[PDB]
Amino acid sequence: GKTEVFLNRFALRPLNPEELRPWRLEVVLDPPPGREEVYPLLAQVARRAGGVTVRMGDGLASWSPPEVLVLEGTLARMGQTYAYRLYPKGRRPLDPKDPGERSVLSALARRLLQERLRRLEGVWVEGLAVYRREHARGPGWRVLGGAVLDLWVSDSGAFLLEVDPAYRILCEMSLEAWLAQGHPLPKRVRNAYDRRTWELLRLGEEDPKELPLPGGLSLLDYHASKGRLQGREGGRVAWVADPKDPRKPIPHLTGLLVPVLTLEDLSLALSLPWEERRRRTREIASWIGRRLGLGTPEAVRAQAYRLSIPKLMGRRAVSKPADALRVGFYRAQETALALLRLDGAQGWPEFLRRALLRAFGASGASLRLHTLHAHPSQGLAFREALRKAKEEGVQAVLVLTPPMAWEDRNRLKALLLREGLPSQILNVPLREEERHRWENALLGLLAKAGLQVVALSGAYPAELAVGFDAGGRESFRFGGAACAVGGDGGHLLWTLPEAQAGERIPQEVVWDLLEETLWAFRRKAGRLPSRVLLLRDGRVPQDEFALALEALAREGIAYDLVSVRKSGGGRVYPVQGRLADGLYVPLEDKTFLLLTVHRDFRGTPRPLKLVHEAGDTPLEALAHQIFHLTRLYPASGFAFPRLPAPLHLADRLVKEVGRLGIRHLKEVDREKLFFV
DNA sequence: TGAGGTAGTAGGTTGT
DNA sequence: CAACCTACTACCTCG
Numbered sequence: 120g121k122t123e124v125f126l127n128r129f130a131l132r133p134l135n136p137e138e139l140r141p142w143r144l145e146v147v148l149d150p151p152p153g154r155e156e157v158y159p160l161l162a163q164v165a166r167r168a169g170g171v172t173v174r175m176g177d178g179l180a181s182w183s184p185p186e187v188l189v190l191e192g193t194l195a196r197m198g199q200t201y202a203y204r205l206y207p208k209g210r211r212p213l214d215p216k217d218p219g220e221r222s223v224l225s226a227l228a229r230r231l232l233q234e235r236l237r238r239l240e241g242v243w244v245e246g247l248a249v250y251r252r253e254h255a256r257g258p259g260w261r262v263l264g265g266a267v268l269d270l271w272v273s274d275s276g277a278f279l280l281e282v283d284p285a286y287r288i289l290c291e292m293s294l295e296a297w298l299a300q301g302h303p304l305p306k307r308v309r310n311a312y313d314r315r316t317w318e319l320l321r322l323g324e325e326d327p328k329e330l331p332l333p334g335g336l337s338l339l340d341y342h343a344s345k346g347r348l349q350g351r352e353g354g355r356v357a358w359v360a361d362p363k364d365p366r367k368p369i370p371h372l373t374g375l376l377v378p379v380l381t382l383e384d385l386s387l388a389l390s391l392p393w394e395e396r397r398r399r400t401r402e403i404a405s406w407i408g409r410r411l412g413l414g415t416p417e418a419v420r421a422q423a424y425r426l427s428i429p430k431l432m433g434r435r436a437v438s439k440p441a442d443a444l445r446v447g448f449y450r451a452q453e454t455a456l457a458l459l460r461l462d463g464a465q466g467w468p469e470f471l472r473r474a475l476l477r478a479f480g481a482s483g484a485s486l487r488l489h490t491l492h493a494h495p496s497q498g499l500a501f502r503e504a505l506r507k508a509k510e511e512g513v514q515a516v517l518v519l520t521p522p523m524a525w526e527d528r529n530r531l532k533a534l535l536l537r538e539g540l541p542s543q544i545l546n547v548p549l550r551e552e553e554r555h556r557w558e559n560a561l562l563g564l565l566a567k568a569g570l571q572v573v574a575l576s577g578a579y580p581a582e583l584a585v586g587f588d589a590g591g592r593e594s595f596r597f598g599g600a601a602c603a604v605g606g607d608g609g610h611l612l613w614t615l616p617e618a619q620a621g622e623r624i625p626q627e628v629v630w631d632l633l634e635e636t637l638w639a640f641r642r643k644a645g646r647l648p649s650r651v652l653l654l655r656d657g658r659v660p661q662d663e664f665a666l667a668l669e670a671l672a673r674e675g676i677a678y679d680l681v682s683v684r685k686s687g688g689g690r691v692y693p694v695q696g697r698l699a700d701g702l703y704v705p706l707e708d709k710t711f712l713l714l715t716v717h718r719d720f721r722g723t724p725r726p727l728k729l730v731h732e733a734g735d736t737p738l739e740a741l742a743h744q745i746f747h748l749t750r751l752y753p754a755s756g757f758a759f760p761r762l763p764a765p766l767h768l769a770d771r772l773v774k775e776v777g778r779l780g781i782r783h784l785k786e787v788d789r790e791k792l793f794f795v
Numbered sequence: 796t797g798a799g800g801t802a803g804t805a806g807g808t809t810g811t
Numbered sequence: 812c813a814a815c816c817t818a819c820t821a822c823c824t825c826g
């Protein structure tokens with residue numbers, strides 16, 4: 120069904136004939152920069168030149184004449200002083216139709232925007248974000264409201280303003296004044312004298328004048344010598360975690376720290392319904408257009424298509440995965456689950472047992488319920504009891520416990536994993552009428568035991584879909600993959616992740632993970648898939664998939680590679696009527712937006728932005744399959760994830776491995792979704 | 796640890 | 812600089 124939408128973009132004035140002919144400048148650096156320093160040094164010169172100037176080629180493009188630029192100057196970069204001189208090389212017309220020249224024009228537009236926002240008052244400007252009014256406030260804190268903005272140039276050579284309302288949380292208070300108001304220690308804190316932030320561990324209470332530092336001086340006079348007490352009091356010692364040393368806590372002074380505030384530190388919800396968001400968006404667009412002399416905003420329209428609604432199946436039709444609990448699962452198998460109580464009570468709660476029994480009765484499969492009597496505090500004998508349970512056929516464990524600290528949770532999880540037992544935690548103040556929570560725990564539990572709760576019924580170009588992501592927060596990451604195999608997504612599998620330096624997944628790693636998913640399809644179907652759908656979370660780094668793609672071509676398997684971007688897709692509003700789910704909005708060549716999840720009384724949806732990197736499947740069939748796979752996720756009973764199931768799975772996989780470690784997974788079946 | 800969503804907070808990787 | 816990502820917590824509501 121055809122329809123039309125507004126984007127949160129606004130067409131403004133045509134570029135005047137001066138802006139269409141920017142000045143070019145050649146850069147001469149002394150000494151000449153190295154291969155690694157050249158491109159970022161050019162970017163630095165662009166900023167240092169002043170006016171409105173950006174990198175273009177090996178040089179600069181400016182909307183200021185050279186006479187009002189800082190043409191000669193200095194540049195500090197990683198402890199080295201470069202002298203730069205700019206040589207003007209005339210003006211030259213750029214054409215908005217040539218995408219490269221248009222790209223230089225858009226870069227100049229973004230620069231124009233930042234610089235012109237700097238001259239707004241009295242509002243709070245932070246780069247490309249502006250905050251206009253105060254939304255809420257309290258003892259020592261306040262929440263401003265404004266918008267994040269972008270500016271670029273259209274192919275017809277007119278400005279395009281993107282606007283998205285946003286809130287900002289500010290603390291105009293020292294750590295001392297904050298704590299004196301009765302508030303608890305914030306998790307994060309910031310230097311009052313600079314931008315550097317620390318993680319606040321605790322309050323040391325020893326004397327700051329008798330606290331020696333690594334180097335002789337006491338805390339107090341170290342900060343005094345740097346002229347930081349000039350204007351404020353030192354206050355108490357605070358201990359902050361070393362950003363680059365998790366083992367050696369660092370001393371500091373609460374009088375020189377300022378709390379950084381999150382929602383955890385302050386009842387006011389900050390999302391907007393889409394109608395209100397759109398309204399504010401238009402108001403801010405016209406305000407900006409008028410203040411910056413960009414003209415009157417004209418809203419951009421795009422043709423949008425409504426994709427068919429997927430038909431989810433348990434034993435029979437369902438609308439949600441929680442329905443499989445009453446109606447039966449897609450594929451049931453003989454299962455055994457164990458209960459571990461960390462709360463001091465006895466056996467299975469009756470309603471949980473009843474619900475499990477009903478589910479397996481409807482599914483026509485046999486259920487065995489076990490109880491773990493041993494406690495994890497018993498060290499190795501506990502592992503012995505676990506091994507006895509697994510030996511007796513147990514596939515997963517439900518842990519009924521009071522809320523656990525992250526460290527204890529991770530430890531328990533890992534311990535169970537090492538014996539090949541995935542676990543589902545359910546927190547122990549538990550009421551039978553809290554149905555959503557415990558039913559969701561039951562779904563988690565069942566997916567972790569390797570059951571397939573739901574599947575799709577449609578016809579899709581690819582019968583294997585695989586998602587790739589990277590996770591972890593240390594100096595290294597884990598690159599991983601998860602897949603939905605079969606035309607129905609009838610099996611969900613993860614593969615052992617790999618440690619990598621950063622976000623880029625090595626080519627051979629990509630191929631090895633994919634190959635494992637191909638092999639999974641081989642074991643299920645007894646053949647190779649005719650076509651696979653490759654979903655990369657975020658951008659595809661240069662040639663990351665080249666080896667995998669060729670490898671697939673050598674096997675005669677067709678493919679589509681799709682970059683799935685969670686941000687950057689802007690906003691999508693209906694021109695008329697209600698905002699509905701499953702909107703496919705094509706844009707430029709190979710790219711499109713996809714609104715996958717929305718319901719009333721939520722905030723404004725955030726459409727995915729998708730780029731077809733390789734393959735020849737029509738954009739709409741891709742959009743269709745991705746939208747449908749978004750409904751395959753088994754562990755969320757009542758709300759579908761924004762990302763298609765293989766990517767939601769991959770994300771959670773690498774996240775959990777980044778949390779626990781990869782060393783625990785050797786005996787855990789890849790059909791068991793331990794990370795959900 | 797119930798889960799997803801949309802929100803906010805911080806910091807990180809890729810590559811001209 | 813680019814245009815994206817990580818991962819935490821809060822409230823709302825339960826396809």
Ligand SMILES: Cc1cn([C@H]2C[C@H](O)[C@@H](COP(=O)(O)O)O2)c(=O)[nH]c1=O
Pocket residue numbers: 310315332333334338341369370371372
């Ligand atoms: C100079 C110095 C500072 N520090 C700590 C105390 C300061 O509060 C903290 C941060 O100071 P900074 O912001 O100048 O880096 O560094 C040491 O632990 N040892 C030292 O030798």
Ligand SMILES: [Mg+2]
Pocket residue numbers: 588589656657816
């Ligand atoms: Mg990612």
Ligand SMILES: [Mg+2]
Pocket residue numbers: 588589590656769770771
């Ligand atoms: Mg992720």
Ligand SMILES: [Mg+2]
Pocket residue numbers: 563794795
């Ligand atoms: Mg879970």
